Symmetry: C5
Subunit: 237 residues, 5 copies
């Protein structure tokens, strides 16, 4: 029942789309886990969704560890935690230290940002038992994707990428790919919980769908998300 990296690999091979959503609290993590969400992303997006800041840069490693521990008490699903700004780019050794704290806090994988210049860090961590989700995002994108794949990234995440390009990347790398605003050709999808639940007022990002509307329970709204992700309904045009 527990979702592992092998689980994601089998799903990629079988073509079964992976459902990912952000999570920052125990209650919602538990709700999403039981609702079918395979990967829970404790992302630095909490700097805006939870802390109410204008950017994610001020989020600290302590903040990430706190929310990771919270989510871990609630959730079978795999917990992925973001290495926060400034906590891992100094060197691969610093990255390892930070990632280690996140793993000790309950994470099963850590997410880092950067292209080819970060590939050495991906390898350093993966070789030491820390699964890595490499966040990237034409030829530059492919190079970044390959670099991290070669380095052993467990998952490659793309944000705001041409559908056609994402498809090519997904077929080029051996590891599963996850996307947001990158089309349905990716091995899976991810959305910020608060966004797909219509927590924020006014229109929503073009690449985000409100799954709250149409249902009278968050539990149903999430299941609908998972459903459309596997049915390849979402993302649509």
């Amino acid at each position: 029942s527990l979702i592992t990296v092998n689980t994601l690999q089998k799903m990629k091979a079988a073509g079964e789309k992976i459902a990912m959503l952000t999570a920052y609290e125990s209650s919602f993590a538990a709700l999403m886990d039981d609702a079918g969400v395979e990967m829970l992303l404790v992302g630095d997006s909490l700097g805006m969704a939870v802390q109410g800041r204008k950017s994610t840069l001020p989020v600290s490693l302590r903040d990430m560890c706190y929310h990771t521990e919270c989510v871990a008490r609630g959730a079978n699903a795999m917990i992925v935690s973001d290495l926060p700004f400034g906590a891992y780019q100094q060197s691969k050794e610093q990255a390892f230290a930070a990632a280690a704290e996140l793993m000790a806090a309950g994470a099963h994988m850590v997410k880092l940002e950067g292209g080819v210049w970060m590939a050495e860090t991906t390898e350093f961590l993966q070789m030491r038992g820390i699964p890595v989700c490499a966040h990237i995002g034409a030829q530059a994108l492919l190079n970044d994707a390959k670099a991290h794949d070669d380095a052993g990234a467990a998952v490659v995440l793309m944000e705001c990428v041409l559908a056609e390009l994402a498809k090519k990347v997904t077929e080029t790398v051996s590891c599963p790919t996850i996307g947001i605003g990158a089309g349905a050709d990716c091995d899976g999808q991810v959305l910020v919980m608060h966004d797909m639940l219509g927590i924020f007022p006014g229109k929503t990002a073009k690449f985000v769908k409100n799954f709250m509307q149409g249902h009278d329970s968050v539990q149903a709204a999430v299941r609908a998300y998972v459903a459309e992700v596997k049915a390849k309904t979402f993302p649509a045009a």
Copy 2:
């Protein structure tokens, strides 16, 4: 409305002069923002204007983060640039990144560092990791106690530009030289005591408001004198910068 690096690049291409002024308090930052200042420099010059010291060297990273947070609560559209203080970034590019990351977390949109070609590697290290850098060359206050010069300055400018510097700031540079640099580097240039051919200008707020006694420096103009309010003084500065009448 928000001023971004892209905004500055478009201004450089259009020949629209950029107005920068130092800021260390929320109230004045809001006033300058509303008066049209496009870049607010939370500089280590506060070591002298705010702390009353004889030089900027004693300013700490905590001091810079504090004033950056203050300015951030008052700024609206203007871009906030924060100085990496003496001793907090020159040990290594790794130390510089650590210090710069603290400033960005405090509210900065760009950090400024002083030094020539020997600091270019640090500029590259920071920019590649998401931290925009303003490279300060020429007469650098942090080294106040310390033909060929022309080429040396040009090489410093090119090194930082090639390293990815978002902006190059020149202080006390021959007008003719500064013009050549501005026409050579791809990034916008800002000057003080460097002529009006730079892509923009900067002055210490307290200097241009005539807060200090005596005569103002040669490359500084008192904008409070001859104007009816602090707001008007700042608007006058922005207007003369864009009209290319300042510096004269």
Copy 3:
């Protein structure tokens, strides 16, 4: 007193080495008196003592604490302490610092997990007077993360000067080949009886956990009237080469 020299003489003589995990003074004294030659203060305490789902959260402070506890109870047995996750993989210098704290806490040897990429660290520590037990095969610290690789890992640590090589859940035939290939003594768990010694988590072999025993684990409490008798039986079977049996391999 059990020294590295003792272990090497035993490997040469074909006399099997008995190792068991230990996290408390009382049990350590009991196992020492019962003939256990190596006491492993392992990060397995993260599960047996702390009740966690993995060993990753175990800190260096935790390891030093249990090492000090075991040192107050042990007498003749050699104390081996695990370097916990995150405390030694950053660099060989960090590993040395962490291992030094464990030696200061009473350890006589430290255990680290990793393949060829850790051989440089093994060398760095051994040269500085810190005996190293190199753990290869199934490494719990990388649970969230083949045959030739195992051989390469063993050879690399042996060449780097590892005092002992420990293998977990490895096909018997392979374990046998490794043991006959490296110069240092080998210890196994779920690796067959051809290793130079064996190790088991104390709580597992005492039947402390409910449910069926792990495949490579034998309940030594059953059939005996005391914890002392259970431990003595384990030591006896290891030396008699009756454990692990075909069923535990």
Copy 4:
């Protein structure tokens, strides 16, 4: 207001520079008013102020404290602060961190002890805005631990690295003269003859604060005067008139 530029112009004009150690605000103000151009907040305070047998126990905190004290008393004089034993020899990076603390405390220049092996550190600091006074010859920090060519090499190494000043202690006068005529930067001497570009003495030594006879290269300037102000002015006058050091020193 004394700057590095001032010192260079003085070297070129042959005007001897007067330097004296200072550890308190009151004496610093007195020396500044008396014409002393360089105030050395030296680790010699380990003996003159702290009463120790050597300068090795002096800490960076002690140096910053005395530097801050002197900075509240000095007006025109340039403040030079010693990097204390242990605070800068680990690496050029450590030296910079230590030197930066001294500059933050009020120093205008820092002094380090060492030969060619320290030149890389001199360059590192100077390039970063920290003026360096390189101390060669007899270096008190190494008190527990052809030879003329080595001194020349040490001086040239630091000069080439960008040292603002080179200080020589207990060196053959003829040798000190050659060095002074060779390096581009000003030289300051103590027990190195009068041909250096300037002189330095420990305040307490030249004020006769210690019992017994002063060192051979030291002159008691208190004798013959009835005010510290006059004693210091006599030192400045004799240094500039080149009557000190005399043949006897």
Copy 5:
């Protein structure tokens, strides 16, 4: 007068044997200084003699600085040599320097480190920065839990690195003699024969403080005298007369 590195070099040159003993307290340090002991070793052996531990590995840098300060308040002319404790100096030459600097600040005049050729780079690093180094080779207690040409290579490496003194422990006398004759610096031995330039013993061992049989290369100098003062003077005298070790 005061015993300096120069004093030791002159003694080696003249063949005058150097007397060294361990010291961990001010009172005993003063007594040994007055009795003619030329080198006082504030050694990590205090982990066993003072702290009562089974090995010297648990001794900390704080412990070493504390005992060094204590000995420095009692000593007058003798040279104080302080051991860099296990874990405090082997990480890098930079770490060793920081640790050694703390010991010098605490009152040491020289620091001792354990290790062969692999530690010579550290010896050079410290010596160049004004910290005299005593290189301890042979049987090193810090490696207790873990040949002729190896010893010679270790001695040569440290001498070439500028070690002020080379200390040999438990080495064949014939080998120790060759080393002493080949290195430029003075040698001190314990269980290394009498052909070294000097000798050292743990104070507690030579005063017969521990119960049990006397260690092979150790002599009980307390026996036959009724004052610790006389016991120490006897040790110094036998070392000088080359009658100890026998």
